[PDB]
Write a protein that binds this ligand. Structure first.
Ligand code: DCP
Ligand code: CA
Ligand code: CA
Ligand code: CA
Lengths: 362, 918, 347
DNA sequence: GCTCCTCTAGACTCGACCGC
DNA sequence: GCGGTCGAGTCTAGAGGAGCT
C-alpha cells in the first residue's frame, strides 16, 4: 500500500482522492492534513520553535498580518465598492513572511534573528496556502557567507535529527535573478527532490525597499539570510521518510509522533477497570503526555488490529489495564519500536514514560 | 631527430648542447640485434606521429659532459655542509656537566660550567635531541645539544613557569630558535622530530640550514629491511633503528640506559619539574651516543655514497614544507563532526536493525533467519513476591477515579527488592539494552556496536552472497580458508574469512582494515547497506584520525608572513596562515626512500571517504602557486633505460623501452593497459602488480596477489596466470622476455661484491651485501636497485632545481615529494619561469640518467613534462573539486580555491619566449 | 495607566512579544481544557479563503488575481469571516473518526477576517454537534463550563459575566461578557443554530448530513475572541499578577555580588529549558536589584532567581516570589523540581 | 616469508552476595 | 539452605609502531 493511502486512512491526510494527487499535495490549495496530520505538524512547529528561539539565543518572535499593505499576490477588493483602483490602493495577501519580519526590524545588537511560523498564500488562478517557518537572520556584510554556511548545516542537522534516513535531506547551491548566492535544502521524495527549505544571502537591497527613507533606521546596515522552511512540505517529508518506502508502521520520532500513549481495558469488570483507566489517563495528561483514549471506544476489535492501528498512527507506547491490575498493579505496556510487552507496575508507568520522552528529546 | 629504431630522439637545438658532438654511433651488429628484438615482439614497424620540435637556449652546462656538470652542481651545493659534518666528525668533547641551568632559553656549559646566557648556539654543527611531554602538549619541554667544545641546553617557558594557561594554538614563539638572524648543519637522531620543534623552520621563504639524520645515514650504511628487522630482534654488522641498538652496533661498550621512569610518554609537568636533573642526564647521554655513532657513520656513508648528488639530495629532500591556512581547522572540525554524525547515524541504523530483529521472536521466526538463529532468545517471567453531567457529579467521579488510582498505587508491597531487567525482551536483547536503573540509561539497544558478535548478524552481512558465521574455535567465517568440520551447521560449509596472516589464525572482526576492499549487507532494509556505507566512508578517518588531528601545525601571525601575501588582495586579516613541516626521515628504508605515514601516501581525495581531502588542504598562501609535475612513469622509465643500456646503446632497443616510450594510454598500447588486456584485470590492480614485478617480487607473490584481488582465482589458476605473466616479461633463464635485459642488469648489479646504483654509485646496506648475507634476500636487492635509482633520480631533480632557482633567481622553495611527485612553492609571477625550470630539470635529469648508462641520447617523448600543474592546492589533477562526504559542496564552492592550469612545454615556451630570464 | 505599562513592557505594540506569548499561553490553555481534558473534541484545519457565494449581500473581501467587475462577485473566493463554516465541512471528515457516534465536537484556533479596511481577529471556535433534544442542556453546560474556564485564570471572577439574547431567526443563544473599564464587551458567544446550518453545506443526500437513531445535529457554536480575551486578562490582572498558567515568562535568572557565575547560570538555564520552563535570561543583559525586581514584576515573572558567589560556596540560589515579594534560599539541584511542583499546583 | 612491544575491547568463567 | 545475580579474572583478536617522543 502506498503511503498516501495510509495517511488518508489514519487521518494524517484529509481530502478527496482528486486532492490526493502529488501536485495537489505540493501546491497547498486544499486542506490536506487530517487531525493526526495537524498534530504532527504542530509537533514539528514546536520542535522548530524550541530549537530556534528557546534553545537558541539572539532569535526572537514576530507577529505579522496576513495582508501586505498596498507582484502576483492576490488582492482584497471590497464588494461594497463593486479595475484601475483595484491595483493601487487595494490590500494584498502575503506570499512570504520575509516582509513581515522586516517590519519588526527593531521596534540594537547584531547578529540576531526574527523567527516566525505562519500561513503564506501561493498562486496555483486558484489560491494555495502553505505554512512557512521563516528565520530572517541579520549579519554584518563580511560574515554573511560564514553565517549562511552555519545556518545551512545547522538546518540540515535539525532536519536530519528526526529523520530515519538522514541521507535523503540533501542540499545544493543556487543563484537568484540578481546573482545573489544561496543554498537550497531538499528531500528525496519518491517522485523527486523538492525544496523543503531555501536560504538566500539577500544583500543590502532588502532593507532598501522596506525602509526607502532614512538609512539611520536600518552600525553596519545588515544583510539578510532569509532562512525559510516549509512545514507543510516538511510534515509530508517526515510522513514519507518514516514509512519504509513487514508491518506498516510510521517510525516517527518520539518528539514528533502525535499519539504517545494508547490506553485500553482488557475485560470485565467494565466499571472498575474503566475508572482505573480514567484515573491513569488523568494522571498522564497533567504531566503533558498526549494520550489516545482507546478504552472509551465502543468499536471492539482484536488486539492484533488494535496494535496495527496504533503502529500506523505512530503510537509510541500501548498500555493495557486488565482485571489483574486491580490486584497488584501490573499493566502490559508495549513499545512500537520493539513490539515487546512489559509488565510494568502502575507506580512506575508515568515516571518511565517521562524518562523515555526526556531521553528521546536529548 | 631520429634513431636507428625510428624513435624521434631529441631535437638538434638541445642535443648539440647536451650530449657529445662526436659521441658514438651504435654498430651494425648492435642495431641489427636491437631491430630483431623489437620485431620479435611486433613492436618494430609501428611509427608514431612526431611531437613538435623544441628550440631552447639551455643554461650553459658546466664541465665537459653531464656527469661533470652535476658533480660540480652537487659539490657547490653540499660543500659548506660536508665541511660541518667533518668538523663534527673529529672533535674533542668536555664531559657532561653534573648540573644544568633552570633558565628560560638556551644555555651553554664549557670547561668552567658557567651559567652562560645563550639565545642562539652560533655553531655550524650541533647534535640535537628534543624532549616533549606527550600528555601536556606537543610544545617542547627541554632539549640538550652539543657542538664541538660545547654542551647546550634549552628549556621551554612551560617548565620555568608553572601556570597552566597554555592554548592548543601553536606559534613559532613556543619553539627552539637555532638559526642566526651562513650555512649550518644540525644533526640528531630522527631529526625530523627536532626540526618540527624548531622555530625558524616554520617560514614560507626557504632556509639555508640543512638537517642530517643519524637514523637516515644508518639506514643507508647498515640498515635492515623490515624482515631483517624482525629477524634481528650480517647480524654483527647491522642493527635496528633505535638509538641504543645503533650505538651498540657502531660504537659499542657501555650500553645506553633505557629509562624505565618514562616521564615523557606517561608523565606530567610535575614529574619532569622534579626529575629535571636526571631527565637531562638521560637526554645528554642520548646525545652523546648519537654523536659517537655519527663519528662512526659519516666516513662509512661518504665511502658508500661517493657521488655528491646523493648527499645534496638528502640535504634537500629533508626540508619539506606544507603550507596551510585557517581551513585546516575547518577541515579537522568538519571531518570530526561528520565522523561523529555518521557514527551516530550508523549506531541508529544498528539499533533499528536490532528493533526490526526482535519481531522474529513473534511466532519464533528467528529459527529460520540465517544470521540470528544461534543467538539467545530466551524470555524471563515477572517475579514480584444522554446528556451533560452536573458539576458535583463530575467532581465526584473525578475524585473517585483518582482515589481508585491512588489505592492501586499502594500495592508495591509485593514487588521484589531488585527489579528485573526487561524480562519480556529476548535474551540477546537484554545484554544490548542498558540497565533500567542506570543513571546513564538510554532507550533501545544503546550498547550495540560494530565490534560485537551481533552486528555482522543484524546487518546480515554476506561475503560473496554468503552469510557471516562465528565459531569459537576458528573465528569469523561464512556459510554457503577451507571447510572446517568443527563447526556443525546443518548443510553449511564454514569457510574462514581470509586473514593477512594466513589460514592458521582467527578473525574476530569482519569490519577490520583487511576487509575494506572486499562483503555486503544482504536482504531487504535500507539501514544495513547504509551502515556499511557509513563504515566505508569513515574507515580512513577512523584508522588515521589520531595522526592527522595531532599533526603539529604552527600558525604564523602577520609578523612573519611574506610581503607577497599581505599585499595580495586574497589575504584576509581574519585568517591564520602557517605550515606543517612533515616529520619524514630522508632515508627511512634500505632503499633510502623517505618514510612518513600520513603525508607520504598514495591516497587522494574521494567522494566516498571522510577526511580524504587532507592533501587538498595544503593550500598555498595568497600569491603562491604549488607548481608541480608528477614524473610521467618514473620508475618504469628508469628500469627501461637500465635494460636499454644493458642491451644496446640506444633507447627503445628493448621491448620494455619501446612500450614505455611509444606506447600510449589512449590506444591502450602502454604497459599497464597491455597487461590488463592480456590478463583481464583492472588498471588499478595491474599497476600494483607491474610495479611489484619491477621490484623483483617473485612469482609466488604474484600468485598470492592474484588470489587476493580476485578470490575467484584458485591456487593453481593463479600460479598458471602468474607464470604466464612473468614468462612474457621476465623470461626464461633470462631470455625471451620484454624485460630480460632489465632484470639481468638488476641481478648483475645486485650480485656484485659491492652492489651500486648504476647512476650515482651508492652502496647497498652492509646487511644485504653478498659477503655478509651470502645469497639471501634477492628480492630485497632487486627492489633496492630500482627504488634507490629512483631516489637518485629525485636527488638529481632536487640538485638541478636548486641550481636553476639560485642561478636565475626564482622565488621558490621545495614543498614536498610525495612518491614521484615534486611540488614547488613558487610565487605567482614565476609560475611560468618555474614551469620552464621544471621542464629543463626533467630534460637534464633524463639526459644524465641516459648518459651515466652510456646511452648518450634522449627521445623527445620523455624529454619534457607532459603537464606542469600550476595550482593552489595539492591534487592529482587541476580539474578536481575535492568532493568528499566531509566536503559535499566541493573545493571551489566551500574553500574558494579556483582551478589551476596544467600547462605543457610548448605553452611554457610561448609564455616565457623560451628564456628563464626576468 | 495600564496601556503605558503594556506598551513599555512589550505587551502592547497590538500585541507585543510578551503579549503574543501570553496569547499563545491562553490559546494553549483553551486547547488543553477544551480538547485534551475534554473527551470527544478534535482539531480542525481549514483554509482561510472560502469557495465564494453568488450573494452580494456578504461583506467579506474577495480574492482577485491581478493577472486577470460584475464577475468578481460570482467566482471569486472570499476571506472567511467566522470559523463556523470551516468546521461544518469537516463533519464527514471527523464523522468516521468517532465512528459516527453523536455527540462529537470540532475545535480550532485560527484567524478570522472581519471588515473594520480588513481586520483580523484570532477566534477560538468550539462547534458542538449535539442532538436536538439535548440542545439547551448542552448549551447551558457549555455556558457554565466556559464561564468557569474564563473565571479560572482571572483574579476577579466577578467581572466576567453572562447573559442571553436571541438570533435573527428567533434562535436562542447565550453571550459571555467581560466588564471592561469602558463597559461590557462580549468575549465569547454561544448560539443554538440548529440543523439549518448543516443543511446548507450539505445540500445532497441526507444520510451524510444519539443512541441507535441518527439525527442531523442541532449544531450550536461556541466562539471566543482570544484577542479580546487576552485584552480582558491584561486588564483584569492589573504590577501585573497574571495567572501562572498564562504568564509568558516563569523564571528570570541573573547574577550578583564572574565567568564561573556565567557558567552556573548557563547550566541552570539549559536545565530549565530542557524541562519545559520558559526562562528570561537576565544574565545576558548589558548591565539595580530593585529595578530588576520592578521590571520582572511588570512583566509578570513568577520567580526571580539570583545566582551569586555563594552559589559556588554553598550551592544556594536566592529565589524571590512575585506573589509574596519575599526572599527564599534553595539548592540549585532542587530549583527545577520546585518550579515544576509550583506550576503543577497552580493549575 | 616471518616475529616482537603495548593498549583496548568483547566474551566465557569463576566465586561471593542475597532474597525466596 | 539454595538457585539467581553480579563484579572481577583471563583470554584473545585487533590495532599504533617496531623511532622520536
Ligand atoms: N605497486 C606499486 C605501485 C606504485 N608504487 C609507487 C612507486 C612509484 O614511485 C609510484 C609510481 O606511481 P605512478 O603515479 O608513476 O603510476 P603511473 O603513472 O604508472 O599510473 P598511471 O600511468 O595509470 O597514471 O608509485 C609502488 O611502490 N608500488
Ligand atoms: Ca631525536
Ligand atoms: Ca632523548
Ligand atoms: Ca608518475
Amino acid at each position: 500500500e502506498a503511503l498516501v493511502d495510509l495517511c488518508r486512512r489514519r487521518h494524517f491526510f484529509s481530502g478527496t482522492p482528486q486532492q490526493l494527487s502529488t501536485a495537489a499535495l505540493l501546491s497547498g490549495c486544499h486542506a490536506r492534513f487530517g487531525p493526526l496530520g495537524v498534530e504532527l505538524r504542530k509537533n514539528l512547529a514546536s520542535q522548530w520553535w524550541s530549537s530556534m528561539v528557546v534553545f537558541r539565543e539572539q532569535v526572537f518572535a514576530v507577529d505579522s498580518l496576513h495582508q501586505e499593505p498596498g507582484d502576483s499576490a492576490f488582492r482584497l477588493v471590497s464588494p461594497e465598492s463593486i479595475l484601475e483602483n483595484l491595483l493601487k490602493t487595494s490590500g494584498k495577501l502575503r506570499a512570504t513572511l520575509l516582509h513581515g519580519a522586516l517590519e519588526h526590524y527593531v521596534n540594537r545588537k547584531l547578529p540576531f534573528g526574527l523567527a516566525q511560523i505562519g500561513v503564506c498564500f501561493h498562486p496555483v488562478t486558484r489560491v494555495g496556502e502553505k505554512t512557512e517557518a521563516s528565520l530572517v537572520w541579520f549579519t554584518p556584510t563580511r560574515t554573511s557567507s560564514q553565517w549562511l554556511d552555519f545556518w545551512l548545516r545547522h538546518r540540515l542537522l535539525w532536519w536530519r535529527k528526526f529523520a530515519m534516513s538522514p541521507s535523503n535531506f540533501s542540499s545544493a547551491d543556487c543563484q537568484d535573478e540578481l546573482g545573489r548566492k544561496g543554498s537550497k535544502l531538499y528531500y528525496s521524495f519518491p517522485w523527486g527532490k523538492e525544496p523543503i527549505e531555501t536560504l538566500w544571502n539577500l544583500g543590502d537591497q532588502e532593507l532598501l525597499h522596506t525602509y526607502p527613507g532614512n538609512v539611520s533606521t536600518i552600525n553596519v546596515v545588515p544583510c539578510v539570510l532569509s532562512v525559510s522552511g516549509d512545514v507543510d512540505l516538511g510534515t509530508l517529508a517526515y510522513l514519507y521518510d518514516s514509512f519504509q518506502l513487514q508491518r506498516k508502521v510510521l517510525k516517527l520520532h518520539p518528539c514528533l509522533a502525535p499519539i504517545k500513549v494508547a490506553l485500553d481495558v482488557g475485560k470485565g469488570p467494565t466499571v472498575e477497570l474503566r475508572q482505573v483507566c480514567q484515573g491513569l489517563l488523568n494522571e498522564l495528561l497533567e504531566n503533558g503526555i498526549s494520550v489516545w483514549p482507546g478504552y472509551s471506544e465502543t468499536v471492539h476489535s482484536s488486539l492484533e488490529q488494535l496494535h496495527s492501528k496504533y503502529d500506523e498512527m505512530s503510537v509510541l507506547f500501548s498500555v493495557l489495564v486488565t482485571e489483574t491490575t486491580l490486584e497488584n498493579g501490573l499493566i502490559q505496556l508495549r513499545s512500537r519500536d520493539t513490539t515487546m510487552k512489559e509488565m510494568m507496575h502502575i507506580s512506575k508507568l508515568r515516571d518511565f514514560l517521562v524518562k523515555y520522552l526526556a531521553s528521546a528529546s536529548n | 631527430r631520429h634513431n636507428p629504431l625510428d624513435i624521434q630522439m631529441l631535437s638538434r637545438g638541445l642535443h648539440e648542447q647536451i650530449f657529445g658532438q662526436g659521441g658514438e654511433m651504435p654498430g651494425e651488429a648492435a642495431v641489427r640485434r636491437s631491430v630483431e628484438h623489437l620485431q620479435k615482439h611486433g613492436l618494430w614497424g609501428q611509427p608514431a606521429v612526431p611531437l613538435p620540435d623544441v628550440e631552447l637556449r639551455l643554461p650553459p652546462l658546466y664541465g665537459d659532459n653531464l656527469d661533470q656538470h652535476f658533480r660540480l652542481l652537487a659539490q657547490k651545493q653540499s660543500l659548506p655542509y660536508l665541511e660541518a659534518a667533518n668538523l663534527l666528525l673529529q672533535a674533542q668533547l668536555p664531559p657532561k656537566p653534573p648540573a644544568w641551568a633552570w633558565a628560560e632559553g638556551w644555555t651553554r656549559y664549557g670547561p668552567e660550567g658557567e651559567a652562560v646566557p645563550v639565545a642562539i648556539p652560533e655553531e655550524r654543527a650541533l647534535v640535537f635531541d628534543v624532549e616533549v611531554c606527550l600528555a601536556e602538549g606537543t610544545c617542547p619541554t627541554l632539549a640538550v645539544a652539543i657542538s664541538p667544545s660545547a654542551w647546550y641546553s634549552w628549556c621551554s617557558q612551560r617548565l620555568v613557569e608553572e601556570r597552566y594557561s597554555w592554548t592548543s594554538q601553536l606559534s613559532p614563539a613556543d619553539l627552539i630558535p637555532l638559526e642566526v638572524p651562513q650555512e649550518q648543519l644540525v644533526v640528531g637522531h630522527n631529526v625530523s622530530f627536532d626540526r618540527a620543534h624548531i622555530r625558524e623552520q616554520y617560514l614560507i621563504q626557504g632556509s639555508r640550514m640543512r638537517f642530517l639524520d643519524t637514523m637516515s645515514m644508518h639506514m643507508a650504511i647498515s640498515g635492515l629491511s623490515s624482515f631483517q628487522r624482525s629477524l634481528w630482534i650480517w647480524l654483527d654488522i647491522s642493527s635496528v633503528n633505535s638509538l641504543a641498538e645503533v650505538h651498540r652496533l657502531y660504537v659499542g661498550g657501555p650500553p645506553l640506559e633505557k629509562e624505565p621512569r618514562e616521564l615523557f610518554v606517561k608523565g606530567t609537568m610535575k614529574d619532569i619539574r622534579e626529575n629535571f636533573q636526571d631527565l637531562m642526564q638521560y637526554c645528554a647521554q642520548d646525545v652523546w651516543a648519537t654523536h659517537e655513532v655519527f663519528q662512526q657513520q659519516l666516513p662509512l656513508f661518504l665511502e658508500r655514497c661517493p657521488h655528491p648528488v646523493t648527499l645534496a639530495g638528502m640535504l634537500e629532500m629533508g626540508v619539506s614544507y606544507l603550507p596551510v591556512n585557517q581551513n585546516w581547522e575547518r577541515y579537522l572540525a568538519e571531518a570530526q563532526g561528520t565522523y561523529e554524525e555518521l557514527q551516530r547515524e550508523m549506531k541508529k541504523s544498528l539499533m533499528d536493525l536490532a528493533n526490526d530483529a526482535c519481531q522474529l521472536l513473534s511466532g519464533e521466526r528467528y529459527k529460520e533467519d540465517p544470521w540470528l538463529w544461534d543467538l539467545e532468545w530466551d524470555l524471563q517471567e515477572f517475579k514480584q513476591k444522554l446528556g451533560p453531567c452536573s458539576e458535583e457529579e463530575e467532581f465526584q467521579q473525578d475524585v473517585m477515579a483518582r482515589a481508585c488510582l491512588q489505592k492501586l498505587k499502594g500495592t508495591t508491597e509485593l514487588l521484589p527488592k531488585r527489579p528485573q531487567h526487561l524480562p519480556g525482551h529476548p535474551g540477546w536483547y537484554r545484554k544490548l539494552c542498558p540497565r533500567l536503573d542506570d543513571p546513564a540509561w538510554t532507550p533501545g539497544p544503546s550498547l550495540l556496536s560494530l565490534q560485537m558478535r551481533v552486528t555482522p548478524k543484524l546487518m546480515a552481512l554476506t561475503w560473496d552472497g554468503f552469510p557471516l558465521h562465528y565459531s569459537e574455535r576458528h573465528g569469523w567465517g561464512y556459510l554457503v580458508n577451507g571447510p572446517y568440520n568443527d563447526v556443525d551447521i546443518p548443510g553449511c560449509w564454514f569457510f574462514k574469512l581470509p586473514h593477512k596472516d594466513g589460514n592458521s589464525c582467527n578473525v574476530g572482526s569482519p569490519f577490520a582494515k583487511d576487509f575494506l576492499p572486499k562483503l555486503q549487507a544482504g536482504p531487504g532494509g535500507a539501514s544495513g547497506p547504509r551502515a556499511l556505507e557509513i563504515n566505508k566512508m569513515i574507515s580512513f578517518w577512523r584508522n588515521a584520525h589520531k595522526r592527522i588531528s595531532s599533526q603539529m601545525v604552527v600558525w604564523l601571525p602577520r609578523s612573519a608572513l611574506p610581503r607577497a601575501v599581505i599585499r595580495h588582495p586574497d589575504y584576509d586579516e581574519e585568517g591564520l596562515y602557517g605550515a606543517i613541516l612533515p616529520q619524514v626521515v630522508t632515508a627511512g628504508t634500505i632503499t633510502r626512500r623517505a618514510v612518513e605515514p600520513t603525508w607520504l601516501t598514495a591516497s587522494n581525495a574521494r567522494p566516498d571517504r571522510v577526511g580524504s581531502e587532507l592533501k587538498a588542504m595544503v593550500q598555498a598562501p595568497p600569491g603562491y602557486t604549488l607548481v608541480g609535475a608528477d614524473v610521467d612513469s618514473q620508475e618504469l622509465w628508469i628500469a627501461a633505460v637500465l635494460g636499454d643500456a644493458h642491451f644496446a646503446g640506444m633507447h627503445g632497443c628493448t621491448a620494455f623501452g619501446w612500450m614505455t616510450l611509444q606506447g600510449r594510454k589512449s590506444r591502450g598500447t602502454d604497459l599497464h593497459s597491455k597487461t590488463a588486456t592480456t590478463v583481464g584485470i583492472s588498471r588499478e590492480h595491474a599497476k600494483i602488480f607491474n610495479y611489484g614485478r619491477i621490484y623483483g617480487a617473485g612469482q609466488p607473490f604474484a600468485e598470492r596477489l592474484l588470489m587476493q584481488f580476485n578470490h575467484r582465482l584458485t591456487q593453481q589458476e593463479a600460479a598458471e596466470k602468474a607464470q604466464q605473466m612473468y614468462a612474457a616479461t621476465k623470461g626464461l633463464r633470462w631470455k625471451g622476455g620484454t624485460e630480460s635485459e632489465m632484470f639481468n642488469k638488476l641481478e648483475s648489479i645486485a650480485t656484485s661484491d659491492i652492489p651500486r646504483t648504476p647512476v650515482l654509485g651508492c652502496c647497498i646496506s652492509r646487511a644485504l651485501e653478498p659477503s655478509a648475507v651470502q645469497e639471501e634476500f634477492m628480492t630485497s636487492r632487486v627492489n633496492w636497485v630500482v627504488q634507490s635509482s629512483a631516489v637518485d633520480y629525485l636527488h638529481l631533480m632536487l640538485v638541478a632545481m636548486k641550481w636553476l632557482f639560485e642561478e636565475f633567481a626564482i622565488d621558490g622553495r621545495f614543498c614536498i615529494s610525495i612518491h614521484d611527485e615534486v611540488r614547488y612553492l613558487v610565487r605567482e609571477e614565476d609560475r611560468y619561469r618555474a614551469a620552464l625550470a621544471l621542464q629543463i630539470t626533467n630534460l637534464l635529469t633524463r639526459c644524465m640518467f641516459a648518459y651515466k648508462l652510456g646511452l648518450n641520447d634522449l627521445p623527445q617523448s620523455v624529454a619534457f613534462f607532459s603537464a606542469v600543474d600550476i595550482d593552489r592546492c595539492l591534487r592529482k589533477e587541476v580539474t578536481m573539486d575535492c568532493k568528499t562526504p566531509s566536503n559535499p559542496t566541493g573545493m571551489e564552492r566551500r574553500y574558494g580555491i579556483p582551478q589551476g592550469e596544467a600547462l605543457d612545454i610548448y605553452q611554457i615556451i610561448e609564455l616565457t619566449k623560451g628564456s628563464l630570464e626576468k
